[PDB]
């Protein structure tokens, strides 16, 4: 009858100062074409703080719901939705407002899943971003050199593995030796701990002809190193720039004043990617990722905070700590929060 959810009550990139936990919210009811899903796991995404800052659509004022992805059980549904779905069914979804005990989701956008496991949730946003961007914009083929930044993170783990499956030589940046050991276990050809080894020098010395593709999630100084490291006809994919999101504008400073000259001289490109412009590819990407995940052909690493200071991310209240965990760069794999029941 009543539930908890997170609500953006003031616009800010500081998630804690933007987002309030409301305790006595009515449970929303599904319409004819809708599922009501009881969330068991929810995904934490770097851009949750871009969302809370109001950067997705600056015309929209608080209050609004938050959280982009969920997995759980159908506990109620509209009559039309009941032709494809049934009460008790395990479903996952990408839609705003997953940070709630219950979320209304139109049946048309639900993804049926084998059971309610956090591994499947890693595929929804993190997996599909890596898959679709690389398939559509990567031009991957055997022997290409691929550099992945935030490689041990939520989407990075997939960009790594998909590039390896495309028979590419893959370099991955991360911030610790434990993350480097994880990258290695995924088949990474050259893991780099950027805190202990200078990435620019590694690339100049070991990849003098440059890299063919960059999956670039970090921005700032890493973006700059990436541009310099591009091969002739190289492609830098701008997936994100997380080093900037906490700032007031959300941007990360770059020394890009000579970027056009660099790109002309190399016949190289900088290509942006936004998931929501490629939704026509989503179902097929999800289907392929799910098959690999269920068959054990894809590592879907989940970080539920079990080794964080206050331990497992349980409950909506832990989302605040989970966002901090990401922004301290502590996670290995996809950060997920559990709503126990």
Ligand X SMILES: O=C(O)Cc1ccccc1Nc1c(Cl)cccc1Cl
Residue 221 interacts with, from ligand X, ligand NAP, Cl ion, none (CB under 5-8 Å by kind): Cl ion
Does 134 engage in binding with ligand X (CB under 6 A)? yes
Instruction: Please name which of 53, 191, 71, 167 lies closest in space to residue 126, comparing C-alpha atoms.
Output: 71
Does 218 engage in binding with ligand NAP (CB under 6 A)? yes
8 Å CB contact between 86 and 74: yes
64 labelled ligand-binding:
no
Does 123 engage in binding with ligand X (CB under 6 A)? no
Binding region for ligand NAP (CB under 6 A) out of 158-166, 183-191, 256-264, 322-330: 322-330
Q: What are phi and psi of 279, to 5 degrees?
A: -65, -25
Does 254 engage in binding with Cl ion (CB under 5 A)? no
For ligand NAP (CB under 6 A), the number of binding residues is 31
Least distance (Å) from ligand NAP to the CB of residue 1? 33
85 labelled ligand-binding:
no
66 labelled ligand-binding:
no
Across 71-106, b (16+ Cβ under 10 Å) vs e yields bbbbebbbeebeeebeeebbbbbbbebbbbbbbbbb
* Residue of the chain from 4, 9, 12, 50 that contacts ligand X (CB under 6 A): 50
Does 240 engage in binding with ligand NAP (CB under 6 A)? yes
241 labelled ligand-binding:
no
* Residue of the chain from 30, 138, 219, 234 that contacts ligand X (CB under 6 A): 138
User: CA gyration radius for the chain?
Assistant: 20
Dist CA 289 CA 155 (whole Å): 13
8 Å CB contact between 286 and 123: yes
Taking the CA atoms of residue 8, residue 14, residue 15 and residue 17 in that order, the dihedral angle to the nearest 10 degrees is: -60
For ligand X (CB under 6 A), the number of binding residues is 31
194 labelled ligand-binding:
yes
Instruction: Write the interaction track for ligand X spanning residues 308-337; mark x where CB under 6 A is met and - where it is not.
Output: ------------------------------
Burial (Cβ within 10 Å: 0-12, 13-18, ≥19) of residue 6:
buried
* Residue of the chain from 108, 267, 269, 287 that contacts Cl ion (CB under 5 A): 108
Q: What are phi and psi of 2, to 5 degrees?
A: -125, 155
Taking the CA atoms of residue 244, residue 247, residue 248 and residue 249 in that order, the dihedral angle to the nearest 10 degrees is: -10
Beta-strand pair 111-112/145-148: unpaired
Dist CA 257 CA 271 (whole Å): 17
Least distance (Å) from ligand X to the CB of residue 276? 4
276 labelled ligand-binding:
no
* Residue of the chain from 41, 102, 131, 182 that contacts ligand X (CB under 6 A): 131
- Assign 110 to helix, strand or coil: coil
Does 96 engage in binding with ligand X (CB under 6 A)? yes
Sites for Cl ion among residues 182-241 (CB under 5 A): 221-222
Nearer to Cl ion, 108 or 267 (CB): 108
Instruction: Please name which of 68, 50, 42 lies closest in space to residue 244, comparing C-alpha atoms.
Output: 50
Q: Which parts of this chain interact with ligand NAP (CB under 6 A)?
A: 45-47, 125-126, 129, 150, 152-156, 173-175, 179, 217-218, 239-243, 273-275, 326-327, 329, 331, 335
Q: Which parts of this chain interact with ligand X (CB under 6 A)?
A: 45-47, 50-51, 56, 68, 94-96, 108-109, 111, 125, 131, 134-135, 138, 140, 162, 165-166, 240, 274-276, 279-280, 282-283, 288
Binding residues for NADP(+): 155, 175, 179, 194, 217, 239, 245, 273-275, 331
């Amino acid at each position: 009858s009543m539930m908890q959810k997170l609500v953006v009550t003031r616009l800010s990139p500081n998630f804690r100062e933007a987002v309030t936990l409301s305790r006595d919210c009515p449970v929303p009811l599904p319409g004819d074409g809708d599922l009501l899903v009881r969330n068991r796991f929810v995904g934490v995404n770097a851009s949750d703080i871009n969302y809370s800052a109001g950067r997705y659509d600056p015309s929209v004022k608080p209050p609004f719901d938050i959280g982009f992805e969920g997995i759980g059980e159908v506990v109620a549904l509209g009559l039309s939705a009941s032709a494809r779905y049934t009460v008790g069914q395990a479903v996952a979804y990408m839609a705003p407002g997953s940070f709630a005990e219950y979320t209304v989701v139109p049946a048309s956008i639900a993804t049926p899943v084998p059971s309610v496991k956090p591994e499947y949730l890693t595929l929804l946003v993190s997996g599909t971003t890596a898959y679709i961007s690389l398939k559509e914009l990567g031009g991957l083929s055997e022997g290409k050199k691929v550099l992945v930044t935030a490689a041990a993170g939520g989407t990075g783990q997939f960009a790594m593995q998909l590039s390896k499956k495309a028979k590419c030589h893959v370099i991955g940046t991360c911030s610790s030796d434990e993350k480097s050991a994880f990258l290695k276990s995924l088949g990474c050809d050259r893991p780099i701990n950027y805190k202990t080894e200078p990435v620019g020098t590694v690339l100049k010395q070991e990849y003098p002809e440059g890299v063919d593709v960059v999956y670039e999630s970090v921005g700032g100084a890493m973006f700059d190193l990436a541009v310099d490291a591009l091969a002739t006809k190289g492609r830098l994919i701008v997936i994100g720039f997380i080093s900037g999101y906490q700032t007031p504008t959300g941007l990360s400073p770059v020394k890009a004043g000579t970027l056009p000259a660099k790109l002309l001289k190399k016949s190289a490109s900088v290509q942006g990617f936004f998931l929501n412009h490629y939704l026509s590819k989503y179902q097929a990407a999800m289907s392929h990722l799910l098959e690999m995940c269920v068959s054990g052909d894809l590592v879907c690493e989940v970080d539920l905070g079990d080794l964080s200071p206050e331990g497992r991310f349980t409950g909506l209240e832990s989302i605040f700590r989970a966002v901090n965990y990401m922004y301290m760069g502590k996670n290995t794999g996809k950060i997920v929060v559990e709503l126990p029941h």
